Amino acid sequence: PIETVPVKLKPGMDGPKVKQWPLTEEKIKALVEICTEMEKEGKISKIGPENPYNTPVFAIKKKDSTKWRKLVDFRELNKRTQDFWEVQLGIPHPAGLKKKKSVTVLDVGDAYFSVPLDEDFRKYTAFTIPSINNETPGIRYQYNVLPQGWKGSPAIFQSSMTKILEPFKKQNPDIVIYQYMDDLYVGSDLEIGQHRTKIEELRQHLLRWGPPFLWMGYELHPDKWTVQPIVLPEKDSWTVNDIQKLVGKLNWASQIYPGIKVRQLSKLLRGTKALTEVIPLTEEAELELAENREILKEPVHGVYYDPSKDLIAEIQKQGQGQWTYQIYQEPFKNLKTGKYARMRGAHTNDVKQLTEAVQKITTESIVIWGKTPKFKLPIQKETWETWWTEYWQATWIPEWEFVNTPPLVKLWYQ
Amino acid sequence: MVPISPIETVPVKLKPGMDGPKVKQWPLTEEKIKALVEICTEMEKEGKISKIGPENPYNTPVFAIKKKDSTKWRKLVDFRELNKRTQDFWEVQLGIPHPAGLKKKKSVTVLDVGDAYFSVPLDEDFRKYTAFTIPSINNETPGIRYQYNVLPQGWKGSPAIFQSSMTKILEPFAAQNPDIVIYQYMDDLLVGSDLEIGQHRTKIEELRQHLLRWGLTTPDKKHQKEPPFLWMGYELHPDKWTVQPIVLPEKDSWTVNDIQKLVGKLNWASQIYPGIKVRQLSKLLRGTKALTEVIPLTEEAELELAENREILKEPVHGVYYDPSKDLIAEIQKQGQGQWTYQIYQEPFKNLKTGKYARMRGAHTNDVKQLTEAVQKITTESIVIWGKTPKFKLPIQKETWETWWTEYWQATWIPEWEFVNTPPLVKLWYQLEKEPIVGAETFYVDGAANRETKLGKAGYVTNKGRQKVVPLTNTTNQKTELQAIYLALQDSGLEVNIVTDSQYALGIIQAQPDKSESELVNQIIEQLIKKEKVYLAWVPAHKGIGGNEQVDKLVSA
Ligand SMILES: Cc1cc(C#N)cc(C)c1Oc1nc(NC2CCN(Cc3ccc(S(N)(=O)=O)cc3)CC2)nc2ccsc12
Ligand SMILES: [Mg+2]
Ligand code: NA
């Protein structure tokens, strides 16, 4: 790789100036070792005080490995980096990826380190390895090559990647390969036995055509990803409280589905009855409940993905390690809903469970639409921003905002 | 001639589009001009500045100032304009070490680098922007024009470039001498080690040997200041540390600027003086911006200040850090949303102390505040010691488990243990998850006229109990809370309550234990006294009996 690609920020935008957040001593030591080797390899270089920019850096351990991985939070630089159409007017997101019986995720970010970075743009990738207790100036570096996690890296490298895949793609016409940031998503319909080997096939390619974590493989099965329609109870005896909750749920669902009616069910609640009193369903109420049940079977109407709009992901804590979520662009028009349980590693740590849910939901969003959603997180900002980097294992990072008022609609997905 | 390595120049640019300065030189008295000529002549002989021709179009004004007992004129180049046009730099000197994070060092030396400061050359292509003019006597000859060859005192980039140049020079020495620590900040180099004073004096010598390779003359800091070293407001003693003496001024008239300074001292002191409180005193400066405005001290502010004075009677000290011991943080609730904490390794020997005040809010509870205090201490500890401390918290393990398992948000506190130091943080009420058999059911509603602000609030129950109360100067949201309050007042120890108020549910599901709304507080007091409360929500205006009935009773 000789010639660099001319890269520039967006009109009237300076480089990022984001503060480095505090790091534990073990993460600093990890980063010191990593950056010392990257510096020997020419991937990064020390910078002087004439560079005022900065992007935060921390260290993670990818799923099921013991080696620290450098993770740069390029979110600010990414939104400030010019939109890219690096050779064509855009690579269409493969709608068939989400349908493959198995999708394996490869960390191919190390391939980026073989392409030089436009010398004029390098100063914008500045980052700092902080010292403990401000006892020394942070160690200042900038990238000489395409950095992992930067929007421009897959774009600039897209030409080099297409060629590496050509032979493999030419041989396997039914395998779907999609690239997002530092990751390669490879879906096939053949079985895991030959899938795992076929995945290894693709690694050797990348290995002959050229890694610290390339050996890993994150296996998905989007064909087995289950949605969550709206379900109503099936009971032989309804209390006043049961019917009140049902009418509340159906009233909420009537914002999503037309033709939901609660007149006959509300009719059962005539009087001022004790909450635990059993109310027999009339024939009019049962029919109404059956018509609502039928309505809720069919999907929502006029729901379409608008590529120009952000995806929004909301998450609710349901308790007992269960989490529900909905992805949408306009309210009440869900493009995807889901439910998680038994997040391994933290039966007694809410924040770790939430961090894993965020990563799994972002992974589903990448597969289905090719971009990450903006999260609405049921957590206080100070708690989240203190701990999420401790459980993060993905090489990308989505955006998030915080929900401070308890949504009433948690009960409806329960 | 011993060849000396040249100090690498830092490339400098002006902000994009902007040009160098063009400020007219003031008129100067003949006396000041003579003084400036002598100074600049000496500076030129030393290489700091050089005469330039008339082609240079930029200019920065220069002044001459006089001192008290030193019968001297000092030079002064007003680089204010040039600084506005100079690029931004990386300022590597934002935060300073906290003494509680430092380890003891047997020996400490202080070198002076003010003269090595001038060996740092200024980027050649940038010097033209530093041009200044000494006016001539009687304005009868051209003014003598100079430009800088070194980092000008007062120029925007001098601190960062000097600091960065020194760090680069020291890098090898520090790396090849792991048994010493070098703190460079300002013109002072501070070297410490656990070596015997003799073997320590040699490392110092080798450091001069090293600094000499770039021709940097550095002798001991003139008038070696006895211990303690006065640094960044601390008293750094060999075995202990503290802020310099904290003296709270005595006054009968307290003004805006007095209470600010009083909080500053109290805040600066709260890092070692344990238990400092500052709400009431910080409270007294809610919105005023006239620092000369006098404010009477609430009797709760005098009690707080008098409490600070007692804590400030005897000075307190902290211990330095031992990485081989545990790091422990203990928190106490002080009241009125105030929290105090101590960080230590051995009991009774604090590394440092601190405090936390609750965030602004209409509603809150002690567990949420305690969680916030823990996060603040966590982040402070990662800065100072690079690790999270073990916490000792005045909350029962069982209380925490109930709180986080049932709280609608995700929440987490790191490894901690209960310490039985009252007052203990507790949960003051817990709503039922299911309706209560045998408990009376209250259907509550309220409503208010937006024009007249007249309202009604009340309930009807399954036993035929009813109440509607007429209210004045109220609102929908107030009548909705008043209705729940009435049902709590008028029911037994176990009660089911049915409301359509999404506003009320939002508040109560947040589990406040205290509010700035007296009406929410009254509801909390009632909830505390109940044995069981089930709160059910229904949508308004849907023909839900009881709800519909009471909605009519209150909608006038
Ligand atoms: C070297 C240094 C000195 C000062 C001062 N003023 C401040 C800082 C921030 C310095 O920078 C570092 N200081 C330390 N530890 C401290 C521990 C306690 N003292 C007090 C002292 C000791 C001995 C004598 S004595 N008996 O010789 O008179 C007098 C006073 C100074 C050293 N650790 C590090 C690690 C990286 S930088 C740095
Ligand atoms: Mg009403
Ligand atoms: Na109370």
Numbering used by the authors:
A (entry chain B): 4 to 213, 225 to 428
B (entry chain A): -1 to 554
Publication passage describing the model:
HIV-1 reverse transcriptase (RT) (hereinafter referred to as RT) plays an essential role in the viral life cycle by reverse transcribing the single-stranded RNA genome to a double-stranded DNA copy. There are two main types of RT inhibitors: nucleoside RT inhibitors (NRTIs), which act as chain terminators and compete with incoming nucleotides in the polymerase active site, and non-nucleoside RT inhibitors (NNRTIs), which inhibit the activity of RT noncompetitively. NNRTIs are a group of structurally diverse compounds that bind to the non-nucleoside inhibitor-binding pocket (NNIBP) located ~10 Å from the polymerase active site. NNIBP is a hydrophobic pocket that emerges only when NNRTIs bind and induce conformational rearrangements of the residues defining the pocket.
Compound K-5a2 features a thiophene[3,2-d]pyrimidine central ring, and replaces the cyanophenyl right wing of ETR with a more extended piperidine-linked benzenesulfonamide group, while keeping the 4-cyano-2,6-dimethylphenyl structure in the left wing of ETR. Y181C and Y188L mutations introduce steric hindrances between NNRTIs and the pocket, and/or eliminate critical π-π stacking interactions between side chains of the two tyrosine residues and the aromatic rings in NNRTIs. Similarly, in the structure of Y188L RT/K-5a2 complex, the cyano-dimethylphenyl group in K-5a2 is diverted away from Leu188 to avoid steric clashes, leading to declines in the buried areas between the inhibitor and Leu188 and Phe227. However, this mutation-caused damage is alleviated by its enhanced interactions with Lys103, Val106 and Pro236.
